[PDB]
């Protein structure tokens, strides 16, 4: 394709644990990351959805990272929509998604500027690790954990 994500993590590269949370009643949310080299960022968002905050967190990781990046998301949708866009691009019977088109397009913009990207899904879980840390940061004031 016009790109292909890595099949396994990029050894040596900084890892961004991304997450977003939104509250449906208010459309308020947060998106951000923590990294294994001690970086972290959280942004507040309005007029948003959980899916958009998860994509926004990936966007921030691509914006703030170097040429090779590992990204761990707990959003099956964010992973799928991005992967399908990559694999199905400038190809035959693919039709652009309806929702979140602008944001996914901006993510794709960032992605083609990278040299290597590993994007993996994990389920949300308990513990003290990376997904847990960023979840708590974006959930504060948005949802009870
Ligand atoms: C308040 C939301 O806290 C979160 O970060 C997430 C919860 C569940 C996710 N998942 O199942 O795609 S992310
Ligand atoms: Mn999440
Ligand atoms: Mn989470
Ligand atoms: Zn608003
Ligand atoms: Zn490189």
UniProtKB/TrEMBL annotation:
Residues of the full protein shown: 167 to 240 of 300
Subcellular localization(s) per the UniProt record: Host cell membrane; Host cytoplasm; Host nucleus; Virion
Protein name per Swiss-Prot or TrEMBL: Gag-Pol polyprotein
